[PDB]
Symmetry: C3
Subunit: 150 residues, 3 copies
């Protein structure tokens, strides 16, 4: 009965000489995301949505392999007494084509959250050529999570 | 009971010689959306696929027909739609007097009562491509239950 | 029972000559938001009206905290109890972490929630766009309610 929702936002710059890692998937591409960690923009947004659902603050309060961060986030959410019910998310990127990699992202997140595949979703959008996202200056992710307090 | 949430995002450019169509409503305006490029129905569509964990709009496919088909697929995965909430971000034109008709369009397409469908509008305070009137963005959130 | 979700978005310009007020907290900074222009409370207000399918902040509507209290009252009177709120402030500067618990406390008090049902997060924009250049501040909110 004790359901809670969270939401998460993250953006990183796209620079050359970094490998591209979104949703724990290394995607072949001539640029990658810039950050202190591996800068996995999708995992960061999801981590934030989970801490938010559980009212545990945010990713900078708590915390690098972003999958390990995601698993520790999930561990702390479980320790606060919440079970995760579902995750949805959107990646907004001009390039590259993310469709061939989506199911793999979905699978990594399921694994890290200990959820079946059917409770995790990843969507991909272009920004229709508008703003810094449209110019391919960075990649944004958005996330939503529903949890319930056991 | 087995609740799930989804979230949707869409943006489209504003261009000359296109009708402005948002939430199924034709709004008098010098320019319209490129793509019927209905940004609001697209966001809601993605929010619903996301909640049912069915992927996204481009993995599946006018916008009202597509919103109807999304609803069909959501029910096919065995979910009922509980509510939809959404925001349109447009510097111009004024959307307020069309919002109720958008809600009515959406409620009909999703076979939902009016009180389970919401549409909100914001400017972007003259900031960015939104503030300059170069595009219109929509955001949506959807709650479903596996019945 | 009858759960519903709302989402909210808000943005304001950051200029000198205005004080910075986010989540009801006055934050010392060379610049502030143009509108009391409380970007966080506006977004949360929008998210609550959205969950209750009551339109948006402009249709209903004093400082932003009284507006939030009136919002919650109307949400109650519509048959809904607030279950939780989560949110994100996106600002390149200044550092918001020290002010987070104050913001949560104001929101919780205004909604009559226990603190552990209100969350506020902070993010930079990695120096991208008008947000990353310190030209505005954005807030996003999600609200869960039940009838
Ligand atoms: N204006 C701000 C912004 C952030 N933070 C705190 O600083 C933290 C790290 N920065 C990030 O914004 C970030 C992390 C991961 N990926 C991309 C960006 C943030 O999580 C918040 O706790 C803060 O105190 N004040
Ligand atoms: N980087 C990306 C981006 C998108 N897609 C896939 O390409 C699809 C279409 N593009 C749209 O972004 C879109 C659709 C409708 N309205 C506005 C925008 C998208 O849904 C995703 O499945 C992808 O494979 N890789
Ligand atoms: N294109 C639009 C945009 C908005 N509105 C109506 O104008 C209202 C207020 N303006 C704001 O967008 C706003 C409020 C607070 N902070 C920043 C911005 C809005 O809530 C909606 O009712 C409208 O009718 N048409
Ligand atoms: K945005
Ligand atoms: Zn990040
Ligand atoms: Zn679209
Ligand atoms: Zn505002």
């Amino acid at each position: 009965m004790d359901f809670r929702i969270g939401q998460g936002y993250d953006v990183h710059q796209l620079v050359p000489g970094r490998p591209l890692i979104i949703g724990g998937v290394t995607i072949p591409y001539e640029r990658g995301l810039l950050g202190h960690s591996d800068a996995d923009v999708l995992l960061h947004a999801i981590t934030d949505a989970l801490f938010g659902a559980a009212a545990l603050g945010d990713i900078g309060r708590h915390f690098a392999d972003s999958r390990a961060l995601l698993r520790e986030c999930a561990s702390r959410v479980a320790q606060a007494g919440f079970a995760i019910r579902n995750v949805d998310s959107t990646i907004i990127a001009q390039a590259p084509k993310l469709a061939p990699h989506i199911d793999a992202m979905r699978a990594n997140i399921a694994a890290d959250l200990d959820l079946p595949l059917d409770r995790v979703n990843v969507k991909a959008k272009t920004n229709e050529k508008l703003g810094y996202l449209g110019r391919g200056e960075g990649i944004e992710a958005q996330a939503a999570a529903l949890v319930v307090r056991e």
